[PDB]
Amino acid sequence: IVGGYTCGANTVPYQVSLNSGYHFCGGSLINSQWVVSAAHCYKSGIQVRLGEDNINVVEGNEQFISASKSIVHPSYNSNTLNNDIMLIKLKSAASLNSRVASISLPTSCASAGTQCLISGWGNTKSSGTSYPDVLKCLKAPILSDSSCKSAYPGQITSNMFCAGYLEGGKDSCQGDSGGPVVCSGKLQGIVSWGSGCAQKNKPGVYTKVCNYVSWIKQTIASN
Ligand SMILES: [Ca+2]
């Protein structure tokens, strides 16, 4: 997260870190046994880390649980990042509490102008590299479809939306991928892609979760 703020420990209780020996992506807890992330974050050997603030220090609210299965969206295209969504099942159910909690799925899509909270342990520099140890947060609005499409000609599908600031300086970034965009207590987006980070006229691009609620629910019901 570039140009954000320190969230505070366990203030974002649905935020997860995906760990394969090191943090490599975010995710969102959507029930005691399932996490949503970005398909471009797929790898084998995932451990899900819940209850984290400092990802390099054991602070006392963590739960580390190995994934038993990952399911990439059936129409994911790694060239265009269309359908950049994956589900991860935990080998055991997490213990839900005030610091480890699920986030609701949307019953309806959000609109341009809605304010959302974006979070992660990604790079904090727009030109340069610096990785935080504690969770960072950014409040940002959803941008219009027309401004999103104008920013990225020929690249924005009906399964994407843009959020952030066209002036630059505030955005998600590398290492935030797969993490949440929450608006009015609903998971509306997944950190997907962008040109660089926090660049002028190049806002963040997010997976449009409301398009996938049917697939998520059916997949969970049968796995
Ligand atoms: Ca920790």
Coordinates of C-alpha atoms in Angstrom, one line a residue, residues 80-181:
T80 CA -5.4 -10.5 -19.5
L81 CA -6.0 -11.2 -15.7
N82 CA -9.7 -11.6 -16.6
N83 CA -11.4 -13.6 -13.7
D84 CA -8.5 -13.0 -11.3
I85 CA -10.1 -14.9 -8.4
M86 CA -9.2 -18.1 -6.5
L87 CA -10.7 -20.0 -3.5
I88 CA -8.5 -21.6 -0.9
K89 CA -9.8 -24.2 1.6
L90 CA -8.2 -24.6 5.0
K91 CA -7.3 -28.0 6.3
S92 CA -9.1 -27.2 9.6
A93 CA -11.6 -24.4 10.4
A94 CA -10.2 -21.3 11.9
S95 CA -11.4 -20.2 15.4
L96 CA -13.5 -17.1 14.9
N97 CA -13.2 -14.3 17.4
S98 CA -13.1 -10.5 17.4
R99 CA -9.6 -10.4 15.7
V100 CA -10.2 -13.3 13.3
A101 CA -13.4 -12.9 11.5
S102 CA -15.1 -13.5 8.1
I103 CA -16.2 -10.7 5.7
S104 CA -19.6 -10.8 4.0
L105 CA -20.0 -11.4 0.3
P106 CA -21.9 -8.6 -1.6
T107 CA -25.6 -9.1 -2.3
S108 CA -25.3 -6.3 -4.8
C109 CA -22.5 -4.7 -6.8
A110 CA -21.0 -1.4 -5.6
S111 CA -21.2 1.9 -7.5
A112 CA -18.6 4.4 -8.6
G113 CA -18.1 6.9 -5.8
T114 CA -18.4 4.4 -3.0
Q115 CA -15.6 4.6 -0.4
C116 CA -13.8 1.4 0.3
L117 CA -10.9 0.1 2.6
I118 CA -8.0 -1.6 0.8
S119 CA -5.3 -3.4 3.0
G120 CA -2.1 -5.3 2.7
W121 CA 1.6 -5.9 3.4
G122 CA 2.7 -4.9 0.0
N123 CA 5.3 -2.3 -1.1
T124 CA 4.9 1.2 0.3
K125 CA 7.0 3.0 -2.3
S126 CA 5.8 4.2 -5.8
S127 CA 9.4 4.3 -7.1
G128 CA 11.5 2.0 -5.0
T129 CA 11.0 -1.0 -2.8
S130 CA 10.1 -1.0 0.9
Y131 CA 8.0 -3.8 2.5
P132 CA 6.2 -3.0 5.9
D133 CA 6.0 -5.6 8.6
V134 CA 2.7 -4.3 9.9
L135 CA -0.6 -4.2 8.0
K136 CA -1.3 -1.0 6.0
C137 CA -4.7 0.5 5.0
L138 CA -6.0 2.9 2.4
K139 CA -9.4 4.4 2.0
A140 CA -10.2 4.9 -1.7
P141 CA -13.3 5.4 -3.9
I142 CA -14.4 3.3 -6.8
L143 CA -13.9 5.1 -10.0
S144 CA -16.4 5.3 -12.9
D145 CA -16.2 2.7 -15.6
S146 CA -15.5 5.4 -18.2
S147 CA -12.6 6.7 -16.3
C148 CA -11.3 3.2 -15.7
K149 CA -11.5 2.3 -19.4
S150 CA -10.0 5.6 -20.4
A151 CA -7.0 5.0 -18.0
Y152 CA -6.4 1.5 -19.5
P153 CA -7.6 1.3 -23.1
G154 CA -8.5 -2.1 -24.3
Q155 CA -7.8 -3.8 -20.9
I156 CA -10.7 -3.4 -18.6
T157 CA -13.3 -6.2 -18.7
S158 CA -16.8 -6.4 -17.1
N159 CA -15.0 -8.4 -14.3
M160 CA -12.8 -5.5 -13.3
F161 CA -13.2 -2.1 -11.7
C162 CA -10.8 0.7 -10.8
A163 CA -10.4 2.3 -7.4
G164 CA -8.0 5.0 -6.1
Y165 CA -6.9 8.4 -7.2
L166 CA -6.1 9.6 -10.7
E167 CA -3.7 12.2 -9.3
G168 CA -1.3 9.4 -8.1
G169 CA 0.4 8.8 -4.7
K170 CA -2.2 6.5 -3.1
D171 CA -2.7 2.9 -4.4
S172 CA -2.2 -0.8 -3.7
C173 CA 1.0 -2.4 -4.9
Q174 CA 3.1 -5.6 -5.3
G175 CA 2.5 -7.9 -2.3
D176 CA -1.0 -6.5 -1.8
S177 CA -2.3 -8.8 -4.6
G178 CA -5.2 -11.1 -3.6
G179 CA -6.2 -8.9 -0.6
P180 CA -9.5 -7.2 0.1
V181 CA -11.4 -4.1 -1.0

